[PDB]
Each structure stands twice: as C-alpha cells, then as structure tokens.
Amino acid sequence: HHSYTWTGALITPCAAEESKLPINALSNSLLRHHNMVYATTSRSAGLRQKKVTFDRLQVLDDHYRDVLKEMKAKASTVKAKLLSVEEACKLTPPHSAKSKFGYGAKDVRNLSSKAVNHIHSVWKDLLEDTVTPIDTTIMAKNEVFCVQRKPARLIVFPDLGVRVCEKMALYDVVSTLPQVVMGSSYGFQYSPGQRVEFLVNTWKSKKNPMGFSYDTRCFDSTVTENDIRVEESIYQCCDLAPEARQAIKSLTERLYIGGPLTNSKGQNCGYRRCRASGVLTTSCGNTLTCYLKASAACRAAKLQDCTMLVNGDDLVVICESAGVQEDAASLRAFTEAMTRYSAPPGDPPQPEYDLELITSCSSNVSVAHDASGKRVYYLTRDPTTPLARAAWETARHTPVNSWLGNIIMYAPTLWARMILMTHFFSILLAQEQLEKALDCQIYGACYSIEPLDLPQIIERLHGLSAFSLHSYSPGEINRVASCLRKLGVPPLRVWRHRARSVRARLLSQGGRAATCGKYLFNWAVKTKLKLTPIPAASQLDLSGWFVAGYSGGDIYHSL
Numbered sequence: 237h238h239s240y241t242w243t244g245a246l247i248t249p250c251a252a253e254e255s256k257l258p259i260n261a262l263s264n265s266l267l268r269h270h271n272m273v274y275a276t277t278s279r280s281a282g283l284r285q286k287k288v289t290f291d292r293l294q295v296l297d298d299h300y301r302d303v304l305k306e307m308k309a310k311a312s313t314v315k316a317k318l319l320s321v322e323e324a325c326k327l328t329p330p331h332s333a334k335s336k337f338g339y340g341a342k343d344v345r346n347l348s349s350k351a352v353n354h355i356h357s358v359w360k361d362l363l364e365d366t367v368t369p370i371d372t373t374i375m376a377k378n379e380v381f382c383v384q385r386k387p388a389r390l391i392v393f394p395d396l397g398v399r400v401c402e403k404m405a406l407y408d409v410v411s412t413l414p415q416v417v418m419g420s421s422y423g424f425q426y427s428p429g430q431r432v433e434f435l436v437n438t439w440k441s442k443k444n445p446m447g448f449s450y451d452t453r454c455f456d457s458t459v460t461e462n463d464i465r466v467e468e469s470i471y472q473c474c475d476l477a478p479e480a481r482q483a484i485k486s487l488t489e490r491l492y493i494g495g496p497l498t499n500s501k502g503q504n505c506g507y508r509r510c511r512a513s514g515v516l517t518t519s520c521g522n523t524l525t526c527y528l529k530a531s532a533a534c535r536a537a538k539l540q541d542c543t544m545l546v547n548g549d550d551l552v553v554i555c556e557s558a559g560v561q562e563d564a565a566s567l568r569a570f571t572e573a574m575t576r577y578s579a580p581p582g583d584p585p586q587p588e589y590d591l592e593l594i595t596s597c598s599s600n601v602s603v604a605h606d607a608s609g610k611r612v613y614y615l616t617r618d619p620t621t622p623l624a625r626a627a628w629e630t631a632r633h634t635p636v637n638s639w640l641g642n643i644i645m646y647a648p649t650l651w652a653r654m655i656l657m658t659h660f661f662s663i664l665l666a667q668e669q670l671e672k673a674l675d676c677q678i679y680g681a682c683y684s685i686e687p688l689d690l691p692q693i694i695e696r697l698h699g700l701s702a703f704s705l706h707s708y709s710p711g712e713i714n715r716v717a718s719c720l721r722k723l724g725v726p727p728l729r730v731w732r733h734r735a736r737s738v739r740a741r742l743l744s745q746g747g748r749a750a751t752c753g754k755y756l757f758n759w760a761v762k763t764k765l766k767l768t769p770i771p772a773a774s775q776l777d778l779s780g781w782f783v784a785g786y787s788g789g790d791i792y793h794s795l
C-alpha cells in the first residue's frame with residue numbers, strides 16, 4: 237500500500253529554473269536581505285519523493301462509517317448537472333498547460349475545432365473505458381519562500397483534454413456538494429471576514445473554549461485508494477445524469493485512484509497510488525476526506541460540543557474545554573484516531589485557549605480598532621511568505637500575482653496596507669499600468685482583476701473599517717516587526733513617506749485612481765479623511781468569489 241513507486245527516472249523541469257531571488261532597481265526599496273529568499277526547483281525533487289513515499293495502513297471503525305452514512309444522506313439531496321463542452325472550455329485558464337495532442341488553452345477558450353473535437357473523443361473514451369489508467373505528468377513546483385530550505389512540492393496532472401472533461405462531469409458537483417455535506421464547516425464558502433466571524437462566534441459559543449489546528453503530514457500522500465473510492469461513493473449519491481455517473485466512475489478508476497507518472501521528457505517516473513494534486517477534485521476530495529476522518533476522530537476522542545472548520549487538508553477544531561490535562565488527553569486520542577484513519581500529524585497538535593493563537597489556513601484571527609475606536613476582528617497571517625513572493629514579483633513577471641491576491645484577502649492587515657499597497661501602486665504609477673488587469677488566485681481559482689477596483693473590492697469584502705484600522709495587537713505588531721528585520725524591510729516612517737507620494741499622484745489622476753489614493757492610503761496622511769462609503773462601487777460580480785476551493789483544479793473565472 238505504498239503511496240508511490242518510482243522507476244529511477246528523475247523529475248525534470250520544462251525549462252531553466254531560477255533558485256536565487258532575481259534583483260532589479262526596485263528590489264532594494266522592498267528588502268535588502270536578498271539571500272533570505274529562494275525558489276524551489278526540480279533539483280530538490282528527489283528529497284520530496286522520499287518524504288511523500290511510504291506505506292499507508294487504514295483501520296476503519298464504526299465512528300468512521302456512522303459519519304460517512306450521514307455525509308451520504310446529505311449528498312443525496314444534491315442535484316448536479318453536466319457542463320457542456322463550451323462551458324467547460326470557458327473555465328480553462330488562458331495560460332493552462334497546452335495539450336500534447338495539438339492544441340493549447342487559448343485554442344480551448346476559443347472553442348477551436350481541433351480542441352473541441354479532441355475533447356469529445358476523450359469524453360467518449362471515458363464512457364467506453366473504465367479500467368485503463370490515464371497518463372499524468374509530474375512536475376516539481378517552483379514556489380518562493382523565505383529560509384527558516386524546503387524541497388519543491390510535486391504536482392501531478394492529466395492532459396488538458398482530460399481536464400476539460402473533468403469540468404464537464406464534476407465542476408457542478410465539486411462546487412455545490414461540499415457546502416451541502418459539511419454545512420458551516422466548509423471553509424471555502426466564507427470570505428476572509430466571514431471566516432473570522434464564524435471563528436469568533438464559534439469561540440464565544442463555548443463556555444470554556446479550547447481550540448486546535450491539525451496538521452496532517454503530507455495529506456495528499458496519506459490519501460488511500462479506499463479514501464478515493466469513498467469520495468466517489470459520495471459523488472454518486474447526488475442526482476446526476478447517467479452520462480455523468482459513468483464519467484465520474486471512469487475518472488475515479490482510471491485517474492483519481494492512481495496512475496503512471498511521466499516527466500517533462502516523456503519518461504516513466506513511476507506510479508501514483510494516492511491523491512493527485514493537479515485534478516479538479518483535489519480540493520473537494522481532500523476537504524470531504526479530512527472532514528470525514530476528523531469528524532469520526534472527534535467522536536472517538538469524545539470531544540465536547542465540537543465545531544470544525546475544514547479547508548482542503550487544513551483543519552481547525554473548537555470545543556468545550558474540560559481542563560488542561562483532560563484536553564491534552566482528548567487531543568492525544570484525536571491524533572491516535574486520525575493516525576488509524578491514515579492521517580498522521582506532521583507536528584503534534586496543541587490545545588490553545590487563545591483564539592488569536594490558533595493558526596489555520598496559514599492564517600489567524602487578530603484584533604484592531606477602527607476610526608470610532610471600536611474593536612474589530614480581522615484575518616491576518618505571518619507576512620514572511622507574502623513579502624518574499626512580492627520581492628520576486630518585483631523583478632520578475634509571473635502568471636499569478638500573489639501580491640494582488642494578498643491585498644484582496646488581507647486588506648485590513650498592517651503589512652498589506654503599509655507595504656504591499658504602497659510598493660506595488662508605486663510601481664504601477666511609474667509604468668502607467670494602473671488600468672492593466674492582472675491575474676491572481678482566490679481559493680485556487682484564477683481571476684483577472686483591475687487594481688483600480690481594489691477600493692471597491694476591499695469595502696465590499698472587508699467593510700470601510702479596513703481603510704482606517706489602527707492600534708493593532710502587540711502580537712501582530714511583533715510578528716510583522718520580526719519579519720521586517722529578517723528580510724530587511726524599511727520601517728514605517730519610510731513607507732509612510734512613500735505612501736504620501738503615491739497618494740498625491742493617485743489623487744491628481746482623478747477617477748478610480750483618486751479613490752485608490754483616498755481610501756487605500758488614508759493611513760499615510762496626518763489628517764485622515766472621514767472616509768465615506770465609496771460612491772458607485774457595487775458593479776463587480778463577486779457572487780462566485782467565495783463558493784468553493786479549486787486548488788490544483790485548473791479553474792478560471794471571468795469577472
């Protein structure tokens with residue numbers, strides 16, 4: 237029951253890979269400790285293969301089946317529809333990996349004949365064949381981090397034609413099934429603000445609150461064939477068209493359960509018997525599986541008034557404390573149950589009695605104050621990785637602008653406002669590209685967003701208070717201060733001086749650019765403005781922004 241079997245062939249890159257942080261004339265204005273930033277490459281692929289390769293053992297008890305039965309009952313109320321080839325094509329990212337059959341992403345979005353014809357042949361084959369493993373490509377992810385160096389993560393994905401087929405049969409399912417089965421526990425249905433709200437209300441709903449995050453060690457690798465088949469049995473509970481049931485069964489048997497691994501050179505690298513990270517059901521499957529195992533584990537551990545929040549492989553549990561020693565015992569029992577379910581922890585879980593100290597989804601709840609001096613809760617995170625990626629994007633253009641996504645998700649934070657907003661708006665001003673739409677990701681989905689709409693986006697998602705937060709917590713202030721010293725980022729006085737310049741320039745620009753200066757940089761000036769609700773700013777269609785997770789799903793949503 238090994239997660240992977242290897243042949244010995246190496247995981248090759250598709251081109252040259254840079255490990256050192258690229259430097260240009262703008263780098264030093266953001267940070268000076270360039271040696272602290274690096275990017276993972278295929279050169280470390282071997283190290284990752286060792287960590288992700290191991291034998292899995294599963295002991296499934298009654299709690300597990302009782303939870304699965306309840307999950308299935310809820311899934312049976314779901315009615316999903318098949319997506320036409322056209323609709324599926326439109327969900328394909330403009331920069332999605334080209335097919336090895338004579339066409340690319342652009343060809344798919346344009347609904348070219350060759351692309352559409354090939355997609356129809358793949359679909360037909362899925363209906364006719366339900367046993368032949370489908371080929372997948374394995375690549376070493378190139379991600380930017382700050383030294384503490386971690387090995388590159390592994391990405392496994394099927395051909396573009398197959399991906400479009402996954403959308404046709406499962407897009408509607410993975411988009412609606414999760415919330416129905418897990419209810420309020422499904423994390424991707426919440427925007428950052430609503431997530432905070434849910435956590436805070438949950439924490440206050442307990443007499444003596446106790447919470448903990450559970451970090452599964454290489455979750456994808458802990459996912460067994462049983463887990464993948466159980467997920468399928470849940471999808472099959474929905475009301476689906478016969479053709480959709482057939483495709484789902486075929487995709488599960490031939491793709492989700494496992495398959496051969498081919499490198500960028502076309503060589504056989506090995507065989508996968510666990511979760512593929514680059515398929516449409518990756519986020520939905522991991523979420524359902526984590527929720528199932530964790531729910532059963534909560535019962536085995538006999539936790540009191542248990543409330544969970546699950547986002548893919550990320551999990552947070554808040555319950556009623558029964559004392560320090562008792563909680564420590566309940567946690568060990570939880571971890572033992574999870575281990576039996578094939579979900580061992582990377583780092584032993586610890587009980588927390590302070591909400592702000594619980595980190596889930598690489599984030600945590602913190603508190604600040606608005607203009608009225610009223611306490612306001614918001615979502616934050618350690619800014620180390622966001623700033624490292626910002627430094628990289630400062631000297632190199634990339635498919636996804638993490639800085640943009642971070643400003644949107646973390647607009648209320650001290651670091652996003654002082655540094656990210658200031659630094660990038662300065663750059664956009666100098667290049668006169670304020671109106672140039674840029675791609676970023678939100679819950680795994682790719683979006684094309686115009687920087688000039690940030691004020692409206694921020695007010696809608698975080699409220700006007702996001703433009704006037706002050707008096708951040710001691711812990712938050714210290715974490716940010718720590719990051720700035722580690723990377724060598726200029727102090728507040730410097731960013732304030734720069735923000736004043738950026739603000740003045742935006743104001744003169746008038747229109748949306750003026751709104752950006754007024755709201756985004758109101759913290760810069762000494763005599764803050766009243767900050768009245770933004771005028772005509774409610775046109776963007778943000779309805780599908782926080783519906784579900786799509787990490788690795790190759791999903792693109794049009795604004």
Ligand SMILES: CCc1ccc(/C=C2\SC(N[C@H](C(=O)O)c3ccc(F)cc3)=NC2=O)o1
Nearest residue numbers: 650653654705706707708713716717728759
């Ligand atoms: C990292 C070191 C550091 C610098 C500044 C702080 C703490 C701060 S700054 C602050 N308010 C100011 C303000 O003018 O309202 C502020 C400054 C910068 C920003 F991007 C937002 C808000 N309230 C706090 O508690 O910590």
